UniProtKB/Swiss-Prot annotation, chain A:
It comes from Escherichia coli (strain K12). Its EC number is 4.3.1.15. Changing residue 188 to N: 10000-fold reduced catalytic efficiency for both D- and L-DAP. Pfam families: PALP (PF00291). Gene3D superfamilies: 3.40.50.1100. It comes from the Bacteria. Belongs to the diaminopropionate ammonia-lyase family. Disruption phenotype: No growth on minimal medium plus DL-DAP; growth can be restored by a mix of 8 amino acids (Arg, Asn, Cys, Glu, Ile, Leu, Met and Thr). PANTHER family: DIAMINOPROPIONATE AMMONIA-LYASE (PTHR42937:SF1), PTHR42937. Transmembrane segments: none annotated. This is Diaminopropionate ammonia-lyase.
Length: 391, 390
């Protein structure tokens, strides 16, 4: 009934409201015009959870269901595929606004090999895009990675190698093999000497944000809040950067949500610079994304560091909705944002927590469900077996 | 995940295949003819869980969703209302088969008062029928009753008294008060000197089985199995009575499901005679003699299970697999389905399926007796993971 899950809320002291022309409206619209051309494109549902909002004491909760993003069960292709197409156009002297998928898929000549490390969705997007554009993909995964996710990459004609090292140590192996064999590294994070690719990725991600805005205008509503789950901060940066260019950073109460075992952005928001940090697949960090960090440091209202089981709570609430609300299949990393709202509601200190997050009877909350049931074994263990329960 | 929840299966050593003409197709159709005259009547969905059936390794799983029964969120009114209408007709010397429910609503006579003990749905059905027919109802509830269930009865214009005694003791207090004030006792269990009302109730319940059979024939399927959750045994006896008249007891693999804290019918099936011994609705204490007679004769197997089996079923029904339809099922409503899921994830899956005669050709009828009658408890199970497996 009433229960306490670790919810740490910290105000962003380093907020200045400086927007980014690099990650704004214009780039997202260009990126979406690329996605519109892909076969089977459809804006993912923005589900209105009216009855859950009434229970939580807010006006509306809106969930962007990225499990419907093609047949990928996750949002990540929006960035990965866009970056891969841009690399193709740069190296093979082509224009992005006039690319043919059947042209590259069938044609002969020089083949690119895209190398990346993933714990799930990113590498699947990279593998997908490589298959669609007739290229090669070598995807590395850390120890303890789910076989279903490995199989999903293999079913896209990509090479997939499971190592006995952790994520961070697997990334370096991908890099060392890439320079050795002449592979092109496609990571969803930035470092010194590597910002081109992750920029396109974040611009690509913002398609969902452009879709969301269009759908919220269709509903005739203006969002007051947005929760964004952050691993390295690539999605949060890209999506917030777009949303902030639409609604202004001062009039959007943005909340960044992280698990407390890898809360890299949270710890960075405390110190004021980059802090280095097993966890839920998708939200692993190690070290924050500089391009994403620049957005959040400037425009994020609050950072949240929360207990693991908050994500599990979100999965169940979305999978078994309240009242007559539509049902959403949401994976562990995809539900943690929604999980926060539920953990606050059932908390003993509900009132003071809602006060801090500026949540009231007028609040209109945007929520992003980043993935569906990418690991069905885990998903059903949570929703049916009650794994990672409350008490 | 692989896990072991207590699923004790006992073969019925007293099975003889003797049907009951008192609980057959004929009375059930008479009861349904009556229900069809009540405002808001609609056959409750028989949901096909095709994708779940494929996962569990059976042909089909069909769930009778009684949460849709007349806006009461449970099946029980089918019995309660029928018995109360019968009594009203007796007092006023009317023929129940030749008149409408609206005629009974505006009927003229001396005012009756109906008294009953319940831990949820039975009393709610009694309270409901009394309001419809302009009569009174005094409902007693045992200690540790949910407030929402108390309110649901109070919202029907009936009296509702929460006691400090258990179910069995509260039954006695209801009988005592009814003799004291001259009320009509309407209980869903039988005993010596009291079989008329429970018979009508069990005959009334059978409407759901009649609907289900019609729906299954519409689908073009024949059930090989049926799981029936049992509190006192009235539903199981009434439904199995009808089903056994339709398909024969030798051709329907019937399984009675009980929580181990009140597995009165299970314990009666192992020992011999009536054994006097939890989730609201499946509390027993003493088995229904009218019900036990049907199960002893026609039930294939009895199941005594862990409470977490029910919670498992709740979650599986409320968050369906693949493209299956979603069903809101309360703790006592979900335990039949829970058994199937507990078997699937069991290490001894193969032997348990073998014992229950579940295979690729099995067509399993499940009854979801109630929806989320306790919204607090329901959301603790499906969201908070209360009564988790591990």
């Amino acid at each position: 009934s009433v229960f306490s899950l670790k919810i740490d809320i910290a105000d962003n002291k380093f907020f200045n409201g400086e927007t980014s022309p690099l990650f704004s409206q214009s780039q997202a619209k260009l990126a979406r015009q690329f996605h519109q051309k892909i076969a089977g494109y459809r804006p993912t549902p923005l589900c209105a959870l009216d009855d859950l909002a009434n229970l939580f004491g807010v006006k509306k909760i809106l969930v962007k269901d990225e499990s419907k993003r093609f047949g990928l069960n996750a949002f990540k292709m929006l960035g990965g595929a866009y970056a891969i197409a841009q690399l193709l156009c740069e190296k093979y002297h082509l224009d992005i606004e006039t690319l043919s998928f059947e042209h590259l898929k069938n044609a002969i000549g020089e083949k690119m090999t895209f190398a990346t490390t993933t714990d799930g969705n990113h590498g699947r997007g990279v593998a997908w895009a490589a298959q669609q554009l007739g290229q090669n993909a070598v995807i590395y995964m850390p120890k303890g990675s789910a076989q279903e996710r490995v199989d999903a990459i293999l079913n896209l004609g990509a090479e997939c190698i499971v190592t006995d090292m952790n994520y961070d140590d697997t990334v370096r192996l991908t890099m060392q093999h890439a320079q050795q064999h002449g592979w092109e590294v496609v990571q969803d994070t930035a470092w010194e000497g590597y910002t081109k690719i992750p920029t396109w990725i974040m611009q690509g991600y913002a398609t969902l944000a452009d879709e969301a805005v269009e759908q919220m205008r269709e509903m005739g509503v203006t969002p007051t809040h947005v929760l964004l789950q952050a691993g390295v901060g690539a999605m949060a940066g890209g999506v917030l950067g777009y949303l902030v260019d639409v609604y202004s950073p001062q009039n959007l109460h943005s909340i960044i949500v992280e698990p407390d075992k890898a809360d890299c952005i949270y710890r960075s928001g405390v110190k004021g610079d980059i802090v280095n940090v097993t966890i839920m697949a998708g939200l692993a960090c190690g070290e924050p994304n500089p391009l994403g960090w620049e957005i959040l440091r400037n425009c994020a209202t609050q950072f949240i560091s929360c207990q693991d089981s908050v994500a599990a709570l979100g999965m169940r609430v979305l999978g078994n909705p309240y009242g007559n609300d539509p049902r959403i299949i949401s994976g562990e990393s995809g539900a943690v944002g929604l999980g926060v709202l539920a953990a606050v509601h059932y908390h003993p200190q509900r009132q003071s927590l809602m006060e801090k997050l500026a949540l009231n009877k007028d609040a209109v909350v945007l929520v992003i469900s980043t993935e569906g049931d990418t690991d069905v074994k885990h998903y059903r263990e949570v929703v049916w077996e009650g794994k990672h329960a409350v008490a």
